[PDB]
Ligand binder design. Structure first.
Ligand SMILES: CCCCCCCC/C=C\CCCCCCCC(=O)O[C@H](COC(=O)CCCCCCCCCCCCCCC)COP(=O)([O-])OCC[N+](C)(C)C
Ligand SMILES: CC(C)CCC[C@@H](C)[C@H]1CC[C@H]2[C@@H]3CC=C4C[C@@H](O)CC[C@]4(C)[C@H]3CC[C@]12C
Ligand SMILES: CC(C)CCC[C@@H](C)[C@H]1CC[C@H]2[C@@H]3CC=C4C[C@@H](O)CC[C@]4(C)[C@H]3CC[C@]12C
Lengths: 147, 455, 133, 98
């Protein structure tokens, strides 16, 4: 009863994630490319072919950090929008890829547009996972398994 | 001649169509409970009997070849007769052709998409391929029109008794859990009751085109009101005995999941051969579409005399006596209807325009019977049945727009008034330049499509 | 010569070849080529479309310990009637599956279990009709 | 031995065996969580479905195992990973052991 009135609670975030996971079509059957990770931080992207938009989750399990994403992903613009955050302070605030800070248990769902997907390259065929590959068609608005 | 037993066997086969396979999902998604959505099939089933009875009166006293265009000419003058000829060429007839062919691809592509809904591009590409094939066969030939009709009405009735017998046997085995606690969440409102009468009445579409049978009836005046008051009430009894056979098998929450309701039923009850339902229903649904395309050239002929609709549309091709310009124009409007809308946004759009002209007709019944016309009428209906059909239809046309407004109604009202503009600027005033746009058009079309005036 | 109202014999002169003959067969063969290219396109879309996700792949599960969720009859132990009361809370989490741990008639409710009858509900959880509701 | 329950391409078996390896982490380190993710996903057969279970009735609750500061980072983890997330009652509000 208390947690469903508070604006930034564990129950409120849980209802935002299970709704985002329900109707996204990118979280349910998108690729999973696990980018490199030092200790104290985890980064992975979810991406589909014809969607033209990728998610980037940066989860910090360490002390704190100021990490520059432009060197790591090499696919990201310099201004990305925060689709979700665990501290919930970043509701719709955009951040600078050059300097993002994560406060010891912070997770972000960054979301941006790109045409260069990580699983299509050659250096990432060893670290991308999908159960049943399926590309997307914008003109037909369907998933198709031929691609 | 045809007796009374055959006097109903034509009308009962006419009423039951592809509406009983598509509407249950839509009438239940507005009643929310098994109890009330069973009284809608009776309430609209009775309202369809008083409609067809009132149409028996106008069909005997006027006694003209036109279907319903005469009845508005005889009562209100030339503007509603034209306004109906306008809408029944751009709204009522094309959209009813698009709903029957949109509901044939819901049943062909439902088995290949088991467990989930098929994409919209599949059920429109398959509907657009049915409209073009149904309208091309009915233009090249006439024998093939009536070749496959008597078989397509067999599959229609074979399934209707298979669903009923199975839904009754299962009721003896005590599968009563679904309608045990009915009415519990009933959302009765002028919003829902109206929108649920649209979809329930669409399953009865075909009661107005029932007057042609009197010509071969053995004793028309004595038997036709009998063949109607025992024929249609026999069909509404076969709908609640078929909608009950749905809720006996599946629950109210699984109904709204699938658009093809009878496909969900054949998997649950007829597992060894469950493909029989999507195969037989696809037969009957493409047979009911064949009946719509046959009558497309009918009304344009009678309206082509009074110079209301263009006379080129009634021209017949010489190689094959088929109304080619009427058909290929009747389908080309349907293709433009399946693109924007889907079944639920078209049953509302159709049953809206169709029901205002259904009202104006039976008000003209009493208005002619009240003041203007004193001619003899062979069969007479009591005064209380027409005043109900008009007071009901005035609720059906006017409650949905105010309570549940939608963009489908706007495009429907803009269509008729657009025809009202074509009245004054083309037929009422008879401008000089208006003629020189018609004459070179008709014969060039005749030149290109080798069609010829009928008589 | 046109005289727009034209019976059979007259127009057969004009409609023979002059210009209006080749559009007829090229438009008649267009609608035929398209009809078998729309029933060919829909088969090509039904075939390449991948199977949709089952109910256990689509949404999260929610594991309930039935003796600790919601008590209905004030006896101090949760039961299957209390799980049914809170089903509207479970659908605000967008849960798809409710996974209830073991509730059979047991003589030992831990140490992985000791079931006395695999086809009965334990009294502290309700009766066999509380489960069907 | 767990991945045998996924079955073979011609003999079908469990739809997935429940992944309880996230429920074992007692210290929230980046390489401890990263090792569980890559160990399940590379050992899994080809066209199978993963699942991520971060708690159960038989282990200390997440707030008492890692800390209250890790309740949110741990629900965002299992909801963006591929597969089915399996939630234990009271992990959405951040319960703790008595
Ligand atoms: C008059 C009667 C009309 C027909 C009635 C109905 C007939 C059928 C009645 C009944 C269905 C019979 C049982 C079917 C069970 C399922 C079988 C199955 O999935 O097979 C597929 C065969 O693979 C295919 O590609 C199948 C293609 C199907 C094309 C359908 C016809 C479209 C045009 C119709 C004519 C239109 C004419 C219009 C003008 C008249 C499996 O392939 P897959 O790759 O394993 O899975 C791919 C699909 N998923 C499962 C992933 C989603
Ligand atoms: C015109 C009609 C009668 C022709 C079809 C006749 C045969 C094929 C039909 C008529 C009635 C049908 C039965 C009706 C009800 C049931 C009970 C159900 O739990 C299993 C199928 C079963 C047992 C059906 C099997 C097929 C059946 C025997
Ligand atoms: C008669 C000859 C000359 C031309 C025939 C053209 C026909 C086959 C074309 C013209 C426009 C087309 C439509 C254009 C857009 C859509 C919407 C899409 O979501 C499903 C397919 C659908 C509905 C197409 C079906 C095929 C279609 C109707």
């Amino acid at each position: 009863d208390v947690q469903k009135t508070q604006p930034r609670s564990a129950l409120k975030l849980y209802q935002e994630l299970s709704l985002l996971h329900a109707n996204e079509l990118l979280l349910s059957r998108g690729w999973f490319c696990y980018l490199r990770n030092d200790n104290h931080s985890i980064m992975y992207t979810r991406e589909l072919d014809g969607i033209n938009k990728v998610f980037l989750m940066v989860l910090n399990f360490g002390e704190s950090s100021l990490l520059n994403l432009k060197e790591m992903i090499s696919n990201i613009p310099t201004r990305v929008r925060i689709r979700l955050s665990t501290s919930s302070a970043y509701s719709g605030r955009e951040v600078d890829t050059h300097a993002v800070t994560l406060a010891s248990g912070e997770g972000l769902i960054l979301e941006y547009n790109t045409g260069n997907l990580l699983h299509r390259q050659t250096a990432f065929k060893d670290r991308c996972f999908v159960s049943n590959r399926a590309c997307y068609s914008r003109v037909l608005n369907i998933l198709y398994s031929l691609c | 001649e045809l007796g009374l037993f055959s006097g109903t066997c034509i009308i009962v086969g006419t009423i039951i169509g592809s509406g009983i396979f598509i509407s249950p999902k839509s009438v239940l998604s507005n009643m929310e409970a098994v109890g009330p959505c069973l009284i809608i099939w009776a309430m609209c089933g009775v309202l369809a009997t008083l409609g067809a009875l009132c149409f028996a009166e106008l069909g005997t006293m006027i006694t003209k070849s036109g279907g319903e265009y005469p009845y508005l000419m005889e009562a209100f003058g030339p503007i509603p007769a034209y306004l109906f000829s306008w809408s029944s060429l751009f709204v009522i007839k094309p959209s009813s052709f698009a709903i029957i062919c949109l509901s044939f691809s819901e049943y062909v592509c439902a088995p290949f998409y088991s467990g989930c809904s098929p994409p919209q591009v599949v059920i429109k590409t398959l509907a657009a391929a049915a409209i073009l094939l149904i309208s091309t066969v009915n233009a090249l030939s006439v024998r093939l029109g009536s070749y496959v009709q008597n078989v397509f009405t067999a599959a229609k009735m074979v399934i209707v008794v298979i669903i009923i017998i199975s839904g009754l046997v299962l009721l003896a085995q005590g599968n009563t859990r679904n309608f045990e606690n009915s009415f519990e969440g009933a959302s009765l409102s002028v919003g829902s009751i109206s929108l649920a009468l649209y979809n329930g009445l669409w399953a009865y579409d075909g009661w107005n085109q029932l007057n042609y049978i009197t010509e071969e009836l053995r004793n028309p005046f004595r038997n036709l009101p009998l063949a109607i008051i025992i024929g249609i009430p026999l069909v509404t009894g076969c709908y609640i005995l078929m909608n009950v056979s749905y809720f006996t098998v599946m629950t109210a929450t699984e109904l709204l999941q699938s658009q093809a309701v009878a496909v969900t039923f054949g998997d649950r009850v007829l597992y060894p051969a469950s493909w029989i339902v999507p195969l037989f229903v696809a037969f009957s649904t493409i047979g009911a579409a064949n009946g719509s395309c046959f009558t497309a050239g009918r009304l344009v002929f009678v309206a082509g005399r009074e110079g209301h609709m263009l006379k080129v549309l009634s021209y017949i091709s010489v190689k094959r006596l088929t109304p080619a310009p009427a058909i290929m124009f009747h389908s080309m409007i349907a293709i433009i209807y399946i693109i924007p809308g889907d079944i639920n946004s078209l049953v509302n759009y159709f049953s809206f325009a169709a029901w205002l002209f259904y009202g104006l007709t039976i008000t003209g019944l009493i208005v002619m019977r009240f003041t203007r016309k004193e001619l003899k009428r062979p069969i007479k209906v009591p005064i209380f049945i027409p005043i109900l059909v008009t007071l009901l239809s005035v609720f059906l046309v006017l409650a949905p727009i105010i309570s549940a407004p939608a963009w489908e109604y706007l495009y429907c009202v803009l269509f008729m008034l657009s025809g009202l503009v074509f009245y004054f600027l083309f037929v009422h005033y008879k401008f000089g330049w208006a003629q020189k746009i018609s004459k070179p058009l008709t014969m060039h079309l005749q030149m290109l499509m080798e069609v010829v005036p009928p008589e | 010569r046109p005289y727009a109202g034209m019976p059979k014999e007259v127009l057969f002169q004009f409609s023979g070849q002059a210009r209006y003959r080749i559009p007829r067969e090229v438009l008649f063969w267009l609608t035929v080529a398209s009809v078998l290219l729309l029933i060919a396109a829909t088969i090509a879309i039904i075939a390449i479309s991948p199977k949709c996700l089952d109910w256990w792949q689509a949404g999260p599960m929610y594991q309930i310990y039935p003796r600790s969720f919601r008590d209905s009859n004030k006896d101090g132990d949760g039961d299957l009637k209390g799980i049914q009361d809170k089903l509207d809370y479970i659908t605000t989490l967008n849960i798809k599956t409710v996974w209830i741990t073991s509730f059979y008639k047991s003589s030992l409710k831990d140490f992985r279990h000791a079931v006395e009858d695999f086809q009965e509900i334990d009294p502290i959880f309700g009766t066999m009709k509380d489960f069907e509701n | 031995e767990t991945m045998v329950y996924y079955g073979l391409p011609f003999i079908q078996e469990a739809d997935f065996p429940f992944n309880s390896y996230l429920s074992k982490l007692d210290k929230p380190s980046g390489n401890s969580v990263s090792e569980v993710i890559t160990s399940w996903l590379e050992n899994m057969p080809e066209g199978k479905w993963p699942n991520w279970m971060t708690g159960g009735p038989d282990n200390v609750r997440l707030t008492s195992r890692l800390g209250e500061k890790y309740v949110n980072i741990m629900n965002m983890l299992v909801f963006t990973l591929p597969g089915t997330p399996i939630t234990y009652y009271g992990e959405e509000i951040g319960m703790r052991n008595i």
